[PDB]
Design an enzyme around this catalytic site. Sequence first.
Site, PDB file in Angstrom:
ATOM      1  N   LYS A 123       0.966  -1.155   0.322  1.00 38.86           N
ATOM      2  CA  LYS A 123      -0.077   0.212  -0.275  1.00 38.86           C
ATOM      3  C   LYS A 123       0.976   1.172   0.065  1.00 38.86           C
ATOM      4  O   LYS A 123      -0.014   2.412  -0.577  1.00 38.86           O
ATOM      5  CB  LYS A 123      -1.230  -0.508   1.262  1.00 38.86           C
ATOM      6  CG  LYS A 123      -2.225  -1.174   1.281  1.00 38.86           C
ATOM      7  CD  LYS A 123      -2.859  -1.279   2.507  1.00 38.86           C
ATOM      8  CE  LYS A 123      -4.147  -2.044   2.678  1.00 38.86           C
ATOM      9  NZ  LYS A 123      -5.056  -1.412   2.025  1.00 38.86           N
ATOM     10  N   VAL A 162     -13.589   2.390  -7.403  1.00 35.98           N
ATOM     11  CA  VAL A 162     -15.470   2.728  -7.025  1.00 35.98           C
ATOM     12  C   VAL A 162     -15.855   0.897  -6.674  1.00 35.98           C
ATOM     13  O   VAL A 162     -16.508   0.819  -6.762  1.00 35.98           O
ATOM     14  CB  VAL A 162     -16.372   2.741  -9.480  1.00 35.98           C
ATOM     15  CG1 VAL A 162     -15.144   3.983  -9.598  1.00 35.98           C
ATOM     16  CG2 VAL A 162     -15.013   2.096 -10.449  1.00 35.98           C
ATOM     17  N   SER A 188     -13.504  -0.427  -3.531  1.00 31.43           N
ATOM     18  CA  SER A 188     -13.252  -0.488  -2.814  1.00 31.43           C
ATOM     19  C   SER A 188     -14.301  -1.265  -1.925  1.00 31.43           C
ATOM     20  O   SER A 188     -15.399  -1.028  -1.004  1.00 31.43           O
ATOM     21  CB  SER A 188     -12.833   0.395  -1.693  1.00 31.43           C
ATOM     22  OG  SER A 188     -12.520   0.535  -0.505  1.00 31.43           O
TER      23      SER A 188
HETATM   24  C1  LIG Z   1      -4.784  -7.739   2.716  1.00 31.99           C
HETATM   25  C2  LIG Z   1      -6.296  -7.116   1.239  1.00 31.99           C
HETATM   26  C3  LIG Z   1      -5.784  -5.099   0.682  1.00 31.99           C
HETATM   27  C4  LIG Z   1      -6.107  -5.252  -0.255  1.00 31.99           C
HETATM   28  N1  LIG Z   1      -6.031  -3.375  -0.625  1.00 31.99           N
HETATM   29  C5  LIG Z   1      -6.206  -3.608  -1.772  1.00 31.99           C
HETATM   30  C6  LIG Z   1      -6.301  -1.927  -1.928  1.00 31.99           C
HETATM   31  O1  LIG Z   1      -6.006  -0.988  -0.957  1.00 31.99           O
HETATM   32  N2  LIG Z   1      -6.523  -1.338  -2.493  1.00 31.99           N
HETATM   33  C7  LIG Z   1      -7.417  -2.129  -4.301  1.00 31.99           C
HETATM   34  O2  LIG Z   1      -7.555  -1.789  -5.258  1.00 31.99           O
HETATM   35  N3  LIG Z   1      -7.356  -3.226  -4.066  1.00 31.99           N
HETATM   36  C8  LIG Z   1      -7.032  -3.762  -3.007  1.00 31.99           C
HETATM   37  N4  LIG Z   1      -7.239  -5.302  -2.830  1.00 31.99           N
HETATM   38  C9  LIG Z   1      -7.940  -6.155  -3.552  1.00 31.99           C
HETATM   39  C10 LIG Z   1      -7.113  -6.422  -4.414  1.00 31.99           C
HETATM   40  O3  LIG Z   1      -6.196  -5.842  -5.720  1.00 31.99           O
HETATM   41  C11 LIG Z   1      -7.407  -7.653  -5.707  1.00 31.99           C
HETATM   42  O4  LIG Z   1      -8.585  -7.033  -6.719  1.00 31.99           O
HETATM   43  C12 LIG Z   1      -8.599  -8.768  -4.717  1.00 31.99           C
HETATM   44  O5  LIG Z   1      -7.764  -9.396  -3.930  1.00 31.99           O
HETATM   45  C13 LIG Z   1      -8.195  -9.769  -6.147  1.00 31.99           C
HETATM   46  O6  LIG Z   1      -7.568 -10.464  -6.163  1.00 31.99           O
HETATM   47  P1  LIG Z   1      -6.343 -11.967  -5.120  1.00 31.99           P
HETATM   48  O7  LIG Z   1      -7.943 -12.945  -5.779  1.00 31.99           O
HETATM   49  O8  LIG Z   1      -5.454 -12.524  -5.962  1.00 31.99           O
HETATM   50  O9  LIG Z   1      -6.264 -11.932  -4.286  1.00 31.99           O
HETATM   51  C14 LIG Z   1      -6.840  -5.699  -1.361  1.00 31.99           C
HETATM   52  C15 LIG Z   1      -7.155  -7.076  -1.386  1.00 31.99           C
HETATM   53  C16 LIG Z   1      -6.300  -7.926   0.082  1.00 31.99           C
HETATM   54  C17 LIG Z   1      -7.251  -9.407   0.348  1.00 31.99           C
HETATM   55  O1  LIG Z   2      -8.549  -1.197   2.281  1.00 32.18           O
HETATM   56  C1  LIG Z   2      -9.466  -2.143   2.134  1.00 32.18           C
HETATM   57  O2  LIG Z   2     -10.017  -2.113   2.689  1.00 32.18           O
HETATM   58  C2  LIG Z   2      -9.777  -2.155   0.771  1.00 32.18           C
HETATM   59  C3  LIG Z   2      -9.617  -1.880  -0.511  1.00 32.18           C
HETATM   60  C4  LIG Z   2      -9.625  -1.843  -2.094  1.00 32.18           C
HETATM   61  O3  LIG Z   2      -9.702  -1.902  -2.260  1.00 32.18           O
HETATM   62  N1  LIG Z   2     -10.458  -3.871  -1.411  1.00 32.18           N
HETATM   63  C5  LIG Z   2     -10.324  -4.610  -0.397  1.00 32.18           C
HETATM   64  O4  LIG Z   2     -10.172  -5.913  -0.085  1.00 32.18           O
HETATM   65  N2  LIG Z   2      -9.586  -3.590   0.662  1.00 32.18           N
END
Ligand SMILES: Cc1cc2nc3c(=O)[nH]c(=O)nc-3n(C[C@H](O)[C@H](O)[C@H](O)COP(=O)(O)O)c2cc1C
Ligand SMILES: O=C(O)c1cc(=O)[nH]c(=O)[nH]1
Length: 350
Positions: free
Chosen positions: A63, A176, A178
């Site tokens: 982050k 759009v 989170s």
């Molecule tokens: C612990 C955690 C924190 C995340 N923080 C963000 C974030 O700050 N901004 C964002 O756009 N997506 C965030 N995501 C979402 C991921 O970028 C991704 O869209 C989503 O987890 C699906 O991918 P995955 O199944 O490979 O994890 C977060 C996901 C997890 C698991």
């Molecule tokens: O900071 C978070 O909670 C967060 C942001 C986001 O875009 N996606 C998510 O899974 N968590």
Amino acid sequence: YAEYLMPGLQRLLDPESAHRLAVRVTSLGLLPRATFQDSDMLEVKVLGHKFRNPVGIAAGFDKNGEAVDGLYKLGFGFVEVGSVTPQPQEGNPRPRVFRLPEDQAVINRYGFNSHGLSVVEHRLRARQQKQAQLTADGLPLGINLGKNKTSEDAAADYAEGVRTLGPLADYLVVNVSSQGKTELRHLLSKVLQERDALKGTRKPAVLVKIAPDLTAQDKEDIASVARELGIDGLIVTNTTVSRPVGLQGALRSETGGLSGKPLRDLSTQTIREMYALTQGRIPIIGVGGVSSGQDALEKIQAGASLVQLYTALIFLGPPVVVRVKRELEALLKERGFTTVTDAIGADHRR
Ligand SMILES: Cc1cc2nc3c(=O)[nH]c(=O)nc-3n(C[C@H](O)[C@H](O)[C@H](O)COP(=O)(O)O)c2cc1C
Ligand SMILES: O=C(O)c1cc(=O)[nH]c(=O)[nH]1
Ligand SMILES: O=C1C(=C2CCC(c3ccc(Cl)cc3)CC2)C(O)=C(O)c2ccccc21
Ligand SMILES: CCCCCCCCO[C@@H]1O[C@H](CO)[C@@H](O)[C@H](O)[C@H]1O
């Protein structure tokens, strides 16, 4: 000693602590550098840049841009610096991260905990030269812009993020995931306007990241506004607030966004729909439950030009990055695709 020890520590720690340690270990470059060489067939030219390989690390792992070089070192074709809010904020109260081992899923409600623009801006500029070379060598840097919790004007926050980090990014993302199609159009128009107002020749691409939780109307409005304003791409699928029947993790009732395997097919289906709705004219970065080269290929074939993964790293460890690329490479050959580019949207050619 990196491996062997790290797998143990993971099991002895709560998910958030494990998250922070992983970022630290990665930034310190304690993990072995991937030896796998990205072949020419894995290269993707999209968003005005060149990607050595189509596998990146999704927003949310790093982050605050603390482990970028370590992530490229792990084999990622590109890095997206986790959501950055204008001002620093702590996010939601703990606990806010949960593992669902049996489902190879995670649920989080971090709430945009961020160091803020000033700090992240300092970190990234300290390595701007290094990044300029990495980018030139096909290892792009993406920056996901977020908004402060108590913020009134979402668009103002995003714009500040564009003016502040845009000069250091190869591409920018606005969630759009989170209000109607109207407010969405106006919010994005202001983002693009701020982007076009940036000094210099290399203007970063602007992508919109959407959740998989969208009504039939939402998907059409997003596609329409994206097509209308000339958005550079879509990152398809942030986490989902749904809890599929059959989840076995005891913590499945917890609030927040679900990621990992349970999101795999839902995510791919969303990519198929958005690709069709935009007629394949808008680059899509597919993400959600990608744990194998097979999963990545399904997303590419459904319409993704690039893919991202996050949660798999948690259940399969760092070896998953090279493993996905290697398998993706063999699956492409095996299926008749001479390059990744030829598979993009393949399911739509019939
Ligand atoms: C612990 C955690 C924190 C995340 N923080 C963000 C974030 O700050 N901004 C964002 O756009 N997506 C965030 N995501 C979402 C991921 O970028 C991704 O869209 C989503 O987890 C699906 O991918 P995955 O199944 O490979 O994890 C977060 C996901 C997890 C698991
Ligand atoms: O900071 C978070 O909670 C967060 C942001 C986001 O875009 N996606 C998510 O899974 N968590
Ligand atoms: O990065 C992790 C994590 C992890 C621990 C360390 C792992 C690891 C394992 C072996 C090596 Cl050689 C290096 C790192 C990587 C995954 C983990 O257990 C979580 O629960 C988590 C939850 C939310 C966001 C990020 C994470
Ligand atoms: C032998 C190696 C031991 C490494 C121990 C790592 C302990 C990390 O511990 C974690 O640190 C985080 C901040 O850094 C805190 O926010 C978490 O609450 C804490 O559990």
